[PDB]
Amino acid sequence: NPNMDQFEAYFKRADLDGDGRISGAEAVGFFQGSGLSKQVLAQIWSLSDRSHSGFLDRQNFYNSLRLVTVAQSKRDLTPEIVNAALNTPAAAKIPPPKINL
Ligand SMILES: [Ca+2]
Ligand code: NA
């Protein structure tokens, strides 16, 4: 499957209970494979849980994956970078991240 959807594959791996949402605990466990600091992952979680419900839907989780890629590229998150990933078609250019599984 050379064109396999890696965002979807990560969503399915992260969603341990199959309820179609990524819970806080599921995100903590999944992103332990990201190589990022807990401070950065906290900021990504906050930015991604747009409804403040404690769960990420698919869109929210894919956006958290995009922010993880930017952080793995050693770019400092700025308000402009965050908005570019969350609210503009620049998001489509961001690869899925590398996650140790
Ligand atoms: Ca879940
Ligand atoms: Na939410």
UniProtKB/TrEMBL annotation:
Could you name the domain of life of the organism this protein comes from?
Answer: Eukaryota
Q: Which residues bind Ca(2+)?
A: D15, D17, D19, R21, E26
Q: Where is the EH domain?
A: 3-93
EF-hand domain ranges (all copies): 2-37
Q: What protein name does the entry list?
A: Calcium-binding EF hand family protein
Which organism is this entry from? Arabidopsis thaliana
Q: What is the lineage of its organism?
A: Eukaryota, Viridiplantae, Streptophyta, Embryophyta, Tracheophyta
